[PDB]
Each structure stands twice: as C-alpha cells, then as structure tokens.
C-alpha cells in the first residue's frame, strides 16, 4: 500500500523519468531540472546500463537490430508530456517554469520514497 510499492506498480517510461530525475538532482538539492536535461539524462542511463531489464525492454519497442543504442531523437519520439502530466497527477512531480522563456522544468517530490522504490525495482538492476 506504500508510495514506493505504488511506483513499482507504474509504467517503465514513468519509472525511467522518475528514477533519472532522482539520480540527476541527488546532491546539491533544488530538485528542479529542465525537461530537456531529464531527457538527455534518460538516454545516458539507458545506454550506460545495457544490463537493466528496463533498458533492454525499451530498446525492443523503439529500436531495430541495426540500432546499437537509444538516441535522444529515438527517445524524444515518446510523449514526455503524458508522463509529466501522469507524474504530477500522482503528486510525485511538479512542473516549474524557467525565468525568462516559459521553458518546462520539473521538480521531484520526496526522493527518499522514490529511491526506496528504485532500490527494490527488479527491472532497474543488472546481472
């Protein structure tokens, strides 16, 4: 019934965004990152962790045999709009606006409840 058990009970796309955001903001707090940056950082997580079931499963749906690794252009193809809207719906994320130009930025809520879910996720581990 926990927050962390409910995250496991979510989609892979949602979890890869959420886990990347928790991993990219962990350090000097703030917990806010540009949506573009979260996308470049998901690519890095996927390509740097071929061993992950998440990485292997995403690749089978959006990539062919000829393709050796996910690119931003191949990933950008997904509706990051819908995941962002679904995550704000679960009260796990907040959309913040960039100071001069209305650029989308995203704020992680309760990283410890997310990281407790990352730690117990079987699709986010390597051999």
| Binding residue for a second copy, selected from 1, 28, 61, 89, defined by CB under 8 A | 61
Asked if 2 interacts with a second copy (CB under 8 A), we say no
Least distance (Å) between residue 91 CB and a second copy: 16
Q: How far apart are CA 19 and CA 109, in angstroms?
A: 12
Count Cα atoms within 13 angstroms, Cβ side, for 69. 12
17 to 56, contacts with a second copy by CB under 8 A?
A: none
Q: Which is nearer to a second copy, 99 or 122 (CB)?
A: 122
SS3 2: coil
68 to 127, contacts with a second copy by CB under 8 A?
A: 76-79, 82, 123
């Amino acid at each position: 019934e926990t927050i962390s058990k409910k995250i496991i009970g979510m989609s892979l796309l949602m979890r890869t965004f959420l886990y990347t955001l928790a991993q990219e903001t962990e350090g000097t707090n703030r917990h806010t990152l540009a949506l573009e940056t979260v996308l470049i950082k998901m690519v890095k997580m996927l390509r740097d962790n071929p061993g992950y079931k998440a990485s292997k499963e995403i690749k089978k749906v959006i990539c062919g045999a000829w393709e050796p690794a996910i690119t931003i252009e191949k990933l950008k193809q997904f509706s990051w709009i819908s995941v962002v809207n679904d995550l704000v719906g679960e009260k796990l994320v907040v959309v913040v606006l960039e100071e001069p130009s209305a650029s989308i930025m995203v704020e992680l809520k309760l990283p410890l409840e997310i990281n407790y879910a990352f730690s117990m996720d079987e699709e986010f581990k390597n051999m």
